Amino acid sequence: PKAGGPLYLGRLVTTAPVPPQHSSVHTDPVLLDFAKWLDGKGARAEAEAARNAGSSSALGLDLELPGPVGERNLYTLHARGRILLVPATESGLYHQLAAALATGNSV
Amino acid sequence: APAPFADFAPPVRPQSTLRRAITAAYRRPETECLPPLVEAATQSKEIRDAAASTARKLIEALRGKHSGVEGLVQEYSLSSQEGVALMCLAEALLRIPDTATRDALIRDKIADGNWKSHLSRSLFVNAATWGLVVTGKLTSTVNDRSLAAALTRLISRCGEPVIRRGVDMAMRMMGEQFVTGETIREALKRSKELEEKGFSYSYDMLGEAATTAADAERYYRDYESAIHAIGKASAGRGIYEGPGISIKLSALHPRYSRAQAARVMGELLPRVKALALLAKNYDIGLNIDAEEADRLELSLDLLEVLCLDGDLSGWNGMGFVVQAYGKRCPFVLDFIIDLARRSGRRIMVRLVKGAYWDAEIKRAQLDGLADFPVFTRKIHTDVSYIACAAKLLAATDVVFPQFATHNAQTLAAIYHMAGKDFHVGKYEFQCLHGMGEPLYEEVVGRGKLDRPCRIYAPVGTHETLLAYLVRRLLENGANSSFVHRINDPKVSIDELIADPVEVVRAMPVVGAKHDRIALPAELFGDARTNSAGLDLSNEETLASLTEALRESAAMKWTALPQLATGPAAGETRTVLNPGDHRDVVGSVTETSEEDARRAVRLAADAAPDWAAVPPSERAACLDRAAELMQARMPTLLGLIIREAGKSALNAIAEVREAIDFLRYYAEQTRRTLGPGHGPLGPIVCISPWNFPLAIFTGQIAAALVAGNPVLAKPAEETPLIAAEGVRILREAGIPASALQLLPGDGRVGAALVAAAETAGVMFTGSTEVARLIQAQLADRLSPAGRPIPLIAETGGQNAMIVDSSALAEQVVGDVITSAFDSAGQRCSALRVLCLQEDVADRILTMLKGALHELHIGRTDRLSVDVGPVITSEAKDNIEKHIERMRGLGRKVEQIGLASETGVGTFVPPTIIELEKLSDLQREVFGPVLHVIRYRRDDLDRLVDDVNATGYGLTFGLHTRLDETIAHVTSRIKAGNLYINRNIIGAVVGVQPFGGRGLSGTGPKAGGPLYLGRLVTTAPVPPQHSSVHTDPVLLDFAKWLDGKGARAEAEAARNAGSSSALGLDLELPGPVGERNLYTLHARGRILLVPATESGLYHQLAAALATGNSVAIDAASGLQASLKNLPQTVGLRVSWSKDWAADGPFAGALVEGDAERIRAVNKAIAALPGPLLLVQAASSGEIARNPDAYCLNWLVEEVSASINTAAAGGNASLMAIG
Amino acid sequence: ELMQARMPTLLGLIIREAGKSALNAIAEVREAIDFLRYYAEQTRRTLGPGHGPL
Ligand SMILES: Cc1cc2nc3c(=O)[nH]c(=O)nc-3n(C[C@H](O)[C@H](O)[C@H](O)COP(=O)(O)OP(=O)(O)OC[C@H]3O[C@@H](n4cnc5c(N)ncnc54)[C@H](O)[C@@H]3O)c2cc1C
Ligand SMILES: NC(=O)c1ccc[n+]([C@@H]2O[C@H](COP(=O)([O-])OP(=O)(O)OC[C@H]3O[C@@H](n4cnc5c(N)ncnc54)[C@H](O)[C@@H]3O)[C@@H](O)[C@H]2O)c1
Ligand SMILES: [Mg+2]
User: Fold this and answer.
1) Nearest CB to C52; choose among A3, A8, A13
2) Measured on CA atoms in the order B542, B547, B550, B555, is the torsion positive or negative?
3) Could you give the CA distance from residue B1021 to residue B1005 in angstroms, rounded to a whole number?
4) Where is NADH annotated to bind (chain B) (predicted)?
5) CA neighbours within 13 Å on the CB side: how many for B143?
């Protein structure tokens, strides 16, 4: 994560905290479709994990940070891109997909 | 048969001179109200100096002893969101009744981490209220994802100790500060301490706005039980030293309104009398709280009867609030003082400023009324208060003044005005529990000012107090509020002791309106004049309207085929009132199909002369017609009421909308139309019966002002109001050759559509009829060989989604209005209410109770809520649907209809509980609400189900949660969205109206793309641009360049810039609402190319506007799209069977004239929605970069958000 | 606080050791100060007993 930004310290502990202002009201639509698919096939725990990832993902965060006058300093969270998934089990793959899709990524 | 309007709105009693002086002041200009108040409030310099000294002394004491939430935030270093989230958690933990159970959950589960796992209802439902507590700011909706993050963060950082402190803080605030006690017995026990010091109490059981008979009965028995407890405790102390009760009339009847005055006097009055008799027996005060401005005068009729009722004689405890922020206040006081004299009852008069200011501003703006019923500058209310106190202090022998205020300046002014002679019973002050005591502990007692104060003491549970805590907090928490200012270190004591009387007196214009609050007529500023409504709570208006309505029923209304040559002969029949077929409204002569064809030829002949009238002068005709409709509104109301089954309220809205269409299209014309925007030619305007003036006028006005002569074919059910609208337009200067009225049925419409000179068709009506028109036009091409433009605005299957965070009373009101107003005969009407499972039973019970309070009948009575259905065939079709549902086992709730309905065609408001949304097939255009339930996790599936009908007109969402708003509004596909309000809004230029799919082709009526469809070359609408470029368009342009298609790549880049996809505007409108207008992709566009270059141009146009495409595989052009970037490939499909691959949202066609005609026929044959097709020849694509117009490849979406839904208006908190 | 008070001395070292101009040496010391204070505040906003170190 970026130095001098709010995700940095969370990389240096074994369980990351929720950084200040780190949330988003947006839910990735592909995540939503994935959760419905999981519930369709009865993968209830996985569908729940998918919905939880969709909500807790901060994808779409778009903040203006305090700074000097005459400047607008913006901070936004976007998808990483394409995530390599190396699952071992079906449930593991569903959980990996949930995490990656909820954050806007392809896999 | 009762004479029309003979019983429209008779007053409860003849209006006395004193009552008429009240009504006369209802909306009096503010500059007229203030001077007499300044005079009445003037005091001697010696008194003003002494008052300022007393005020300063009180304020110095207040600031010298001046934290619970603040201390908690400080101790744990909480952010604002953390503080709010903590209080929401504490509130939720306090819903756990057993204390040991709650503490165990905290210590073992909540503190350990997963608070979400242990706590169907968002923790943050009431976060707007806690936000006001923590931050002093009101945010209408809740950022529940921010709060969830903050709660996780604070618990993981601070653990059980912060939770414990939050729970204890919330417990104290909700149990001891916002209420005196949870029950009347608890409140009475806690009142002894301050009573011993000289305070008294008035208990507020917190009941308000009954929605059902059962609610009203519950509030009644709560008041009755409280009176017993208060009276037992009073123990003979009497009405001044002893405690009393305060009641709200709206709690005691579900239809407490002037429209239902007869029910109020018959049903509410005896209940108040029964409570008053009990208060009399215990000799306690019983105060009637003051509510909205439109209830003031009605409440006076109850006060009058009660004070004259001999059964209540001997008791002086009847009390009544008057609101000094209201322009009628001094005249109301004159009335009350006189009533006290006549009755011999020493009425207890509580003078307040007023609690509903924001809402009164919004309501007057929404209703288009002449002015506000309240002041708009806070200092005006202060002067009003002091002037009214002077009136009350001169009448202490006949009334008992009660000065309710937390403002030390106000208090000091009155303390000195009242003088040195005092005894208990002369007057008192009043304050709110848990707010006013710091001030009044400097007032009560021989060691202070030795004046008594009565504490208004809310009593109730956490659920009851949270319901309207937002309104109560804004009373003393807005930037203009004294209590806010006393806590602001930037506000000096000198500023707080400023004398409002002398400040107002020295102003350059005494009593000027607030600069930042628009009068309703001025909502749109320089753009146009807002239409004006009528105040159906104003007795002068009701009396004048009664006469105008009666006079309208004596007119010989006719509708004739008004050809350019003059009225034509034809088959004549009467037009009967749908609510009573014995009431003949007028006569219509219908147009022969031969005369319809002749009218089109005359329109074609006259087209050049009308096109030559400059756009500014055409717009001037529209503006003159608007003025004429505004002046004629009362007569137009009467016709609409009797011809179309509309109530007066709905007829007012109908005429206002027509006025607004005229003025909006006139202004849009002045902004856009020039010599190069040539008219299409004769336009056939076919309109529905259900908005028989507004939509009729809108289509015709748009076509005319765009320079086209019009053939106006009104619905066969409602020709009379259409004929009158044509008469008005002709009077306004539209030549007879430019506007021909052709009454008759669908045959006349079809004959007009089929006429060779018809250059465009504007249709509003059913989807099935639009499909027939679509088929007719697929045979036809313009003389230039292009499709005849069709605007087809059609039916809806409109849903409202309600989650467990919504306020049930608000939901039910918006549902009753949206589903059953006009007997559901609005295209926007709510058809499917979707209730989250956890709240569905409670809301359904409330909804059914509210349903049974509706009055169904002939609409020439103000008391009628729901009128008839338009015809017996409409009735038969609706009832066939109801019986089919009933036959399937579905639960069906129906109002019982009065016997008087037998003379008309009525269907009772009906609620049908469905299992699945798939249970509905087509639009049922009547008073039939369907109810489905959903589990929260299935919300996304539910939105899919709503979209799956194929309709897309109106949609509502009731929720407080930003995550749910973002999710639902991003996934729903409808043209008009409404958040936390009803779904029937179509305010021209504010909610541009029109849907997608089976609901419309667009462009939206009342929006900025409309006129451009009615000319051959569309202008650039005002504000119509976007800085955003579709990224797939960009990828396609690079691909074109890589293929060597340099000219097409340039055209693609130009399309990317020219596209207005991504436009996102806020439209000016009333306070307390945000009205948004955005341009989105339409969806999947069918491309029917002929050449490779044509395909590239079609794809550029479609991609630049955000769409995907299905390309006709029969074009053989597959090899032209080899090696597309994956981003573009995702948007591109090839279709061999167009009917299998839809629904499409539009089409682009390339070919010669006969190819276009053949394709147009094939497109019309596709199932489902009508497609907005644009066609061009290959040569046209080469010559004209705008061969395909990007205006018609985006979809307009309007969203109206009620930002006052949390209980107040944040932006108006800064307007004083 | 110590780096802020000692900035003039730190500047001299940075100027001579790393080839920085005075303005850029000031920016260097300011950035170190800001990192210190920023991570201190971010810690005060977030870290609790369950956020164990690596
Ligand atoms: C015991 C008690 C009982 C009450 N009962 C009722 C009741 O039954 N019905 C009712 O409506 N109110 C009632 N009120 C009053 C209302 O609830 C507020 O408390 C009161 O209006 C605030 O006035 P204040 O003098 O305490 O404060 P102030 O800060 O002096 O005045 C604030 C008031 O100014 C007014 N105001 C604010 N901005 C503007 C503006 N831009 N233009 C014009 N006016 C403005 C509003 O009335 C606002 O509440 C009661 C108040 C008390 C203390
Ligand atoms: N989308 C909107 O803005 C909007 C607004 C109001 C009403 N509507 C819809 O209108 C419908 C109710 O109005 P209605 O009952 O008058 O509709 P309708 O379809 O019955 O009639 C509409 C008009 O079309 C005419 N007509 C009928 N058959 C025709 C034909 N074969 N060819 C040409 N014209 C023909 C009628 O005479 C009438 O003037 C509802 O479905 C409602 O949802 C839509
Ligand atoms: Mg019809």
Assistant:
1) A13
2) negative
3) 14
4) 687, 689-690, 713, 716, 765-766, 793, 923
5) 21
Method used to determine the 3D structure: X-ray
Name which of B565, B683, B627, B699 is nearest B994 in CA terms.
B699
Q: Which residues of B touch A51 (CB under 8 A)?
A: 937
Q: Residue B1196 in contact with residue B1002, Cβ under 8 Å?
A: yes
CB atoms within 10 A of CB B1005: 25
DSSP letter assigned to residue B368: T
CB B1007 within 8 A of CB B997: no
Q: Angle at the Cα of B1009 (from B1007 to B1015), degrees rounded to 5?
A: 130
- Would you mind telling me the total number of residues written for chain A in this entry? 107
Please tell me if the CB atom of residue B715 comes closer than 6 angstroms to any atom of ligand 2: yes
Antiparallel, parallel or unpaired: β B683-686 and B760-764: parallel
Resolution in A: 1.4
Asked whether the beta carbons of B261 and B12 are under 8 A apart, the reply is yes
Is residue B848 within 8 Å of residue B931, measured between CB atoms? no
Strand B739-741 vs strand B891-894: parallel, antiparallel, or unpaired?
Answer: unpaired
Are residues C39 and A10, on separate chains, in Cβ contact within 8 Å? no
Q: Do B790 and B774 contact (CB within 8 A), yes or no?
A: yes
Instruction: Indicate the burial class of C16 (C-beta count within 10 angstroms; 0-12, 13-18, 19 or more).
Output: exposed
Question: Nearest CB to A4: which of C35, C48, C53?
Answer: C35
Beta-sheet strands, E only, within A1-107? 62-65, 73-76
CB burial of B1083-1109 (b: ≥16 within 10 Å; e: otherwise) equals bbbbbbbbbbbbbbbbbbbbbbbbbbb
Strand locations in B828-867 (E): 830-836
What are the angstrom distances between the C-alpha of B378 and each of B409, B432, B512, B1194? 14, 20, 12, 46
C-alpha B725/C-alpha B728 separation (Å) is 5
Q: Which of B1048, B1156, B1145, B1044 is nearest to B1094 (CA)?
A: B1048
Residue B497: name the closest of B51, B73, B21 by CA: B51
B966/A26 CB distance under 8 A: yes
Encoded amino acid at B785, one letter: G
CA–CA dist B883, B53 (Å, integer): 76
Burial of B233 (0-12, 13-18, 19+ CB in 10 A): buried
- Neighbour count for residue B43 (Cβ, 10 Å): 18
- Which positions in chain A have a beta carbon within 8 angstroms of at least one beta carbon in chain B? 17-27, 29, 32-33, 35-36, 39, 47-48, 51-52, 55-56
The ligand minimizing its distance to the Cα of B688 is: 2
Is residue B793 annotated as a catalytic residue, yes or no?
Answer: yes
Place of tokens 């009205």: B1075
What are the two backbone dihedrals, phi and then psi, of residue B226, each rounded to the nearest 5 degrees? -65, -40
φ, ψ of residue B389 in degrees (nearest 5): -65, -35
Q: Are B549 and B585 in contact (CB under 8 A)?
A: no
Partners of B576 in the β-ladder: B584
Phi, psi dihedrals of residue A11, rounded to the nearest 5°: -80, -15
For the record, the structure tokens of B994 come out as 């029109």
B753 lines ligand 2 (CB under 6 A): yes
The residues near B384 (Cβ < 8 Å, ≥ 6 apart) are: B33, B37, B324, B325, B326, B329, B330, B375
Is A55 within 8 Å of B971 when comparing Cβ atoms?
A: no
3-class secondary structure for B1175-1211?
EECHHHHHHCCCCCCHHHHEEEEEEEEECCCCCCCCH
CA B1077, B1082, B1083 angle in degrees (round to 5)? 140
b/e B971-1002 (16+ beta carbons within 10 angstroms → b): bbbbbbbbbbbbbbbbbbbbbbbbbbbbbbbb
CA gyration radius for chain A? Answer: 16
Do residues B858 and B827 touch, judged by C-beta distance below 8 A? Answer: no
Question: What is the DSSP secondary structure assignment for residue A8, as one 8-state letter?
Answer: S
